[PDB]
Amino acid sequence: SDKIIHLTDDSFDTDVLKADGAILVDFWAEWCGPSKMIAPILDEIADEYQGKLTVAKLNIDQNPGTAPKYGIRGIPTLLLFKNGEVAATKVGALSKGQLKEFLDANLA
Amino acid sequence: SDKIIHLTDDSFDTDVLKADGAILVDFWAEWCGPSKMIAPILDEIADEYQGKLTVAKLNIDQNPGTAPKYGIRGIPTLLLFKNGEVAATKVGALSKGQLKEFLDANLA
Amino acid sequence: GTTKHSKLLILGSGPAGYTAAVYAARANLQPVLITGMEKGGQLTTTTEVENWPGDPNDLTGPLLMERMHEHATKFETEIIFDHINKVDLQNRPFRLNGDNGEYTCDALIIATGASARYLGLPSEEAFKGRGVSASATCDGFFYRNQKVAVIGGGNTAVEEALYLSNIASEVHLIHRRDGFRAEKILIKRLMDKVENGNIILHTNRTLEEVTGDQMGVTGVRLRDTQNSDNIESLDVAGLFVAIGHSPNTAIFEGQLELENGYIKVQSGIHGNATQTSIPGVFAAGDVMDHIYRQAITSAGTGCMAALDAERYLDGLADAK
Amino acid sequence: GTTKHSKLLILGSGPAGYTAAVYAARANLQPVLITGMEKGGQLTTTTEVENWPGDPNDLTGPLLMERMHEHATKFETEIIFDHINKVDLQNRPFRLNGDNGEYTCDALIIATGASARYLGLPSEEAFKGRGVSASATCDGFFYRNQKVAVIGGGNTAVEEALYLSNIASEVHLIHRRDGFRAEKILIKRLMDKVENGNIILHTNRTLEEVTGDQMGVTGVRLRDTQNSDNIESLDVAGLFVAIGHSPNTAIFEGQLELENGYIKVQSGIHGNATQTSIPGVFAAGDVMDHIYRQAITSAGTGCMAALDAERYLDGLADAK
Ligand SMILES: Cc1cc2nc3c(=O)[nH]c(=O)nc-3n(C[C@H](O)[C@H](O)[C@H](O)COP(=O)(O)OP(=O)(O)OC[C@H]3O[C@@H](n4cnc5c(N)ncnc54)[C@H](O)[C@@H]3O)c2cc1C
Numbered sequence: 001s002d003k004i005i006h007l008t009d010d011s012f013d014t015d016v017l018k019a020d021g022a023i024l025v026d027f028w029a030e031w032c033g034p035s036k037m038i039a040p041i042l043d044e045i046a047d048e049y050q051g052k053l054t055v056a057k058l059n060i061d062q063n064p065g066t067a068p069k070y071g072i073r074g075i076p077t078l079l080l081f082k083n084g085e086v087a088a089t090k091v092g093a094l095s096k097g098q099l100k101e102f103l104d105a106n107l108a
Numbered sequence: 109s110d111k112i113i114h115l116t117d118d119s120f121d122t123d124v125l126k127a128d129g130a131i132l133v134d135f136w137a138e139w140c141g142p143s144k145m146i147a148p149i150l151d152e153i154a155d156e157y158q159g160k161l162t163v164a165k166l167n168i169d170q171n172p173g174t175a176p177k178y179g180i181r182g183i184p185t186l187l188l189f190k191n192g193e194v195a196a197t198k199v200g201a202l203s204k205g206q207l208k209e210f211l212d213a214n215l216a
Numbered sequence: 217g218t219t220k221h222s223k224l225l226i227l228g229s230g231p232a233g234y235t236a237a238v239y240a241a242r243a244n245l246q247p248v249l250i251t252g253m254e255k256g257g258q259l260t261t262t263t264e265v266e267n268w269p270g271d272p273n274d275l276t277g278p279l280l281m282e283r284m285h286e287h288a289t290k291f292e293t294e295i296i297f298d299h300i301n302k303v304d305l306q307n308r309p310f311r312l313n314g315d316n317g318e319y320t321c322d323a324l325i326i327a328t329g330a331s332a333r334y335l336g337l338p339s340e341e342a343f344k345g346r347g348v349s350a351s352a353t354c355d356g357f358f359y360r361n362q363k364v365a366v367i368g369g370g371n372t373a374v375e376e377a378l379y380l381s382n383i384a385s386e387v388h389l390i391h392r393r394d395g396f397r398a399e400k401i402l403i404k405r406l407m408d409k410v411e412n413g414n415i416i417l418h419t420n421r422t423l424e425e426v427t428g429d430q431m432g433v434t435g436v437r438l439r440d441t442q443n444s445d446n447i448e449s450l451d452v453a454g455l456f457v458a459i460g461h462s463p464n465t466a467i468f469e470g471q472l473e474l475e476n477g478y479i480k481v482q483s484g485i486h487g488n489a490t491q492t493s494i495p496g497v498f499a500a501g502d503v504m505d506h507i508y509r510q511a512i513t514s515a516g517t518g519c520m521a522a523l524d525a526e527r528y529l530d531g532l533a534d535a536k
Numbered sequence: 537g538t539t540k541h542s543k544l545l546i547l548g549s550g551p552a553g554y555t556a557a558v559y560a561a562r563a564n565l566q567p568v569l570i571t572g573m574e575k576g577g578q579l580t581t582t583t584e585v586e587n588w589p590g591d592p593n594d595l596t597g598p599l600l601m602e603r604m605h606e607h608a609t610k611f612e613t614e615i616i617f618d619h620i621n622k623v624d625l626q627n628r629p630f631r632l633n634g635d636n637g638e639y640t641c642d643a644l645i646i647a648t649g650a651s652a653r654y655l656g657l658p659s660e661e662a663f664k665g666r667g668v669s670a671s672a673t674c675d676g677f678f679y680r681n682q683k684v685a686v687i688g689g690g691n692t693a694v695e696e697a698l699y700l701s702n703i704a705s706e707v708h709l710i711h712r713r714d715g716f717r718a719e720k721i722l723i724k725r726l727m728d729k730v731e732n733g734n735i736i737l738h739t740n741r742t743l744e745e746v747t748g749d750q751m752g753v754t755g756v757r758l759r760d761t762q763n764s765d766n767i768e769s770l771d772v773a774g775l776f777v778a779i780g781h782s783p784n785t786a787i788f789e790g791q792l793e794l795e796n797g798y799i800k801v802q803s804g805i806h807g808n809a810t811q812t813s814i815p816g817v818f819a820a821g822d823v824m825d826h827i828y829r830q831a832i833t834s835a836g837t838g839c840m841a842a843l844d845a846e847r848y849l850d851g852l853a854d855a856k
Pocket residue numbers: 227228229230231232233250251252253254255256257258259261262264265266267268298299300301327328329330331372464467500501502503509510511512514
């Protein structure tokens with residue numbers, strides 16, 4: 001809630017694809033429950049990872065372009081970028097601990 | 109639905125108390141389930157007991173003036189009249205056999 | 217001489233019966249359900265329902281059952297208005313007689329629920345319809361702005377005093393224990409009124425007699441549960457007995473294992489939990505539950521009765 | 537340092553838990569409920585729900601569950617978004633460990649439900665997220681006018697097949713047998729669509745492997761159950777596995793008597809029916825039901841759990 005970005009198909013190439021640093025991407029959709037279930041976790045994460053990561057949500061419900069580009073045929077799917085480069089991805093719902101396990105595994 | 113006399117507070121004595129013959133009076137209300145659960149059985153009684161009995165439904169939702177008159181502090185309550193004369197009375201719900209077992213034990 | 221056969225026959229139109237109905241219907245079992253004299257079940261004798269998971273507001277026993285009924289017929293359940301007063305479970309198909317015919321079924325789901333208890337006093341019976349009532353829902357308005365009395369200590373008793381308290385000038389709650397078994401949240405609303413409102417407690421008392429004249433009840437006489445010889449009068453215009461319910465199993469008397477009136481069922485965590493002592497005969501709802509007795513628990517076992525009967529009827533179709 | 541303590545704690549935000557939540561909240565047990573990662577339960581992964589008694593039309597899992605959340609919070613249930621990783625049931629108060637903090641409670645209601653089951657094929661894993669999916673309601677979007685597969689013969693498969701049917705160009709239902717276990721009413725909808733719709737039946741076949749490239753799943757290989765080596769190839773855009781579930785009882789390893797994954801309860805027609813192996817610990821919902829597993833049965837048991845918990849907690853207060 002202090003770094004989250006309502007990313008769009010336009011402001012992506014510039015935001016994620018080209019920005020030194022790790023920006024996590026939570027692909028969601030108003031129709032997929034577990035999708036929006038991760039948003040809260042991202043916020044509880046926003047602070048603890050503020051300086052190593054920037055949580056950025058993306059609504060394919062109104063932003064198609066993006067998803068296909070990376071072959072994402074499932075939601076929610078998380079993409080951990082590093083200098084506009086998919087470095088790691090996690091699929092499906094998960095707990096704050098499984099997500100911190102994921103970030104600490106790569107992002108460090 | 110065509111024999112059961114849907115009485116009215118005013119037109120009561122002018123119906124049940126004066127008109128000769130054994131006429132059964134059903135005091136009911138749209139708020140008392142058991143009251144409206146009798147409606148069916150009364151039909152299969154107006155027919156199954158025709159000529160030897162008359163059925164009259166005195167709803168009280170909007171006809172309170174009559175109930176008091178006989179000391180009816182509870183519905184549904186059935187009063188078996190005989191020209192302004194209570195011959196019998198049946199307080200409470202009941203099945204078809206129930207009602208008939210009362211109509212027979214009484215009527216002659 | 218009209219006899220009716222059906223693979224599946226459901227006895228009861230309460231939440232248990234109706235849930236067994238929608239499940240059986242969706243199993244294309246073509247179920248026939250007999251409503252019983254109290255169509256809708258007990259929930260029809262109450263007002264607001266607050267514990268039916270998913271309906272947090274404005275739900276009423278009547279409305280819920282209006283919805284369940286609609287729901288049972290959506291999948292073409294055959295609802296017949298009738299009461300059953302005799303059954304032969306010793307021979308197949310099963311024999312059930314009502315005020316409209318003979319019924320035969322290859323499987324039977326019993327969901328007859330329970331009926332309001334009674335005190336068994338001649339004064340109590342002598343004043344019905346004239347002061348002694350069974351439903352505040354029905355007669356409550358005959359006591360507006362008058363002294364009224366309730367007797368019981370469970371959720372009904374309490375919900376009745378709470379309900380009546382907004383009608384009668386004052387409510388007198390009579391009960392044996394010094395404590396109530398009604399849900400906590402409710403006892404609080406109760407006590408709040410016993411304090412700032414018009415509800416008056418009469419703990420440790422037992423109704424000895426309903427007194428009155430040739431026009432209706434005018435008072436009630438209580439007895440002490442501690443001092444056997446101490447007694448007290450109570451000027452009251454009406455009495456509502458709410459001392460529980462007894463399971464509807466007289467017709468099944470000597471037809472299947474009954475334990476204190478409640479139909480005994482296999483239970484267990486190995487399926488076929490709603491099966492009575494007679495194969496093909498299942499029980500659900502309050503008729504087979506003397507502990508919980510809730511709308512939601514009854515809906516559940518009702519669902520189980522269906523799944524159990526289907527699993528049973530499937531077997532018969534395979535031997536065919 | 538700030539371990540949150542409570543008389544009762546409920547695990548799970550599904551129908552079973554939320555019902556226990558509200559019944560326990562009314563017994564004024566000031567319940568604390570932990571949602572889990574799948575807040576709302578399995579029902580949240582479905583669309584229409586046709587057998588929730590009293591909801592004849594247009595009801596959807598999400599809706600029913602959003603309604604239960606509201607209901608449980610209405611009676612002041614402390615709902616906490618968290619997931620329990622470890623539990624200690626040998627020391628009272630019981631110790632439960634979650635990602636957002638540590639919890640202790642005098643009584644516990646385990647309503648952890650179950651998770652989607654998988655085959656165990658690495659190809660299945662390799663493509664999860666790129667063609668292999670568990671929820672159609674979530675990913676059916678990615679298959680507009682494309683061929684897609686479903687594997688399983690239960691209600692979930694059929695419904696997903698039926699649902700996918702109006703999204704994909706063609707649906708291929710794969711199953712280990714010639715027979716389906718889903719409700720008839722549904723099996724009928726299936727065939728009726730198999731006969732003149734876009735659903736293709738692939739009976740007596742089992743998922744042997746999922747094929748594809750960096751861009752996702754391109755097809756699958758079924759096996760044929762009646763000819764060990766008849767392996768056939770099927771060109772498809774993605775597949776949804778629907779082969780049942782398994783109770784979420786891992787965090788309870790060797791602390792509660794389990795039976796094929798499911799938590800064992802006393803059951804029986806004498807109360808304390810949801811009592812687990814450890815006094816003061818109860819289980820309701822699919823986590824303790826290997827048979828019926830419906831939303832209505834889960835809500836039923838969640839209720840008994842709350843009531844059993846109260847009977848227990850009161851006992852503690854009494855014997856003090
Ligand atoms: C005033 C009151 C308020 C209540 N409030 C709540 C509440 O807020 N929440 C809650 O969870 N629970 C509440 N309950 C309890 C709840 O009503 C029951 O646990 C539940 O409805 C029982 O369901 P059932 O289907 O088993 O039986 P019932 O509802 O009793 O239904 C039995 C059915 O069987 C039929 N029947 C009986 N005998 C025969 C026969 N011989 N032949 C044919 N048909 C027959 C009847 O006509 C009826 O349709 C309340 C009860 C009362 C009395």
